[PDB]
Amino acid sequence: XIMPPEAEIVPLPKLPMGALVPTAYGYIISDVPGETISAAISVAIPKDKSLCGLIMEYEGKCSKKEAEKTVREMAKIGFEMRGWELDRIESIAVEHTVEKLGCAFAAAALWYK
Amino acid sequence: XIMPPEAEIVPLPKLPMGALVPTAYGYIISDVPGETISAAISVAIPKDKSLCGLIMEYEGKCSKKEAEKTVREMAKIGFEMRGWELDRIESIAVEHTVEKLGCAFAAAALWYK
Amino acid sequence: XIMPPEAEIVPLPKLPMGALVPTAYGYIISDVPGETISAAISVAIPKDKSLCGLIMEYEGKCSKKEAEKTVREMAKIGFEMRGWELDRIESIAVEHTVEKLGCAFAAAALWYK
Amino acid sequence: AEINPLHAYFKLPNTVSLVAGSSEGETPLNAFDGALLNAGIGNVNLIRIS
Amino acid sequence: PLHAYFKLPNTVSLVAGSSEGETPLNAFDGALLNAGIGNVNLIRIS
Amino acid sequence: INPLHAYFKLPNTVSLVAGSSEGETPLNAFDGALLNAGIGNVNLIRIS
């Protein structure tokens, strides 16, 4: 996940090493050569600024495109369940083709201004 | 889990959206139609209030009744392992009959008065 | 995981009951009578004190010696991936021979002096 | 009135509340989200304690 | 201090333990007790 | 009035990051992915 009301999506700040960062994340690890794995993260931002944002994560044996499409829909569904009006959904995804043993990871890190 | 010493069991307070809430929880997700799933939570409270309470969680493919009985016994065992005097055990449970994809969840949320 | 820069490895402090302690840990549970299970933790310390330490955890159906060797190697690898000069690696390990149902656990508890 | 328990390590929680809920969902995470909402704790960040 | 200063953890302590248990969670609780951190709330870091 | 004790209150920013990496072990691959994402040197407290 939940983005606090009035919080802003910002580029990753300069984090102090060792910081205890509240983070929502999705990840997938695979040891199958040639397998494509992906992880994605999304955040549904409400029109009503008094409400909170909903963070969703996804991982799976699929493409970067499919992972992002899926996670965005998951965030939208969360807002549907709440009956909240949508401003926009921001998301990012990553894919990895396993050579020997790989990991795909996506996260939403909560921090301070 | 651990209920801090002198903590009071209270109905869930109004929580600010996005709050970081320390929570002990048990959950189970099933995609098997007609399957009954349950989750339960228990808190063993000590007679000596200077001591902490013990929170136990449980989830499984069983009834709400079985889940609660099991989680209560788990909290009792924890006090027996410590050799502490048990005052009582507060518990809650929930059961869900899966339609297509369902989740049963039980939790002990630690907060402030 | 991550040991903050300037943090010190010290004997477990007196922790208040119920304290929310950030902890990196590895554990394994087995119900196979006679089975040996182990858990281990390692902390790679940097030569450059402006950098952080790396905490690694390992668990498996093996001996204490194998678990500790593996977890120390994992920390070394982490430092190699970062290209940081390694000062030394501190670790701890434990093994348990299951009677009926047992658990082996190893952790690095982060706190405040 | 806000508090980050991970930073204010010196201020321990002094209350505990038991909640429970269930829900169907289009995905495992949406079902989980639904169950939290049903339990009355769907709009907060749960920091799992162990 | 009269004004709480924000800080990251400055101590790290290595502990370990093991234990039998009637259930997985009770065995885990016993292991934490044997390790010396059974009566605190562990916030697992990743 | 400039806010004080801001770090003791609720987080007010969210950043989306992602990365991937190979690794000799699952944990080393995970660590590599975090490093690739830019958050490899901080402690992640998983929120659910």
Ligand SMILES: N=C(N)NCCCCN
């Ligand atoms: N870099 C991290 N925060 N995590 C991955 C490496 C440490 C795993 N205990």
Ligand SMILES: N=C(N)NCCCCN
């Ligand atoms: N409502 C929650 N706190 N969690 C479930 C929804 C968010 C999953 N990242």
Ligand SMILES: N=C(N)NCCCCN
């Ligand atoms: N003693 C602990 N902190 N944990 C072990 C028992 C956990 C039950 N939720």
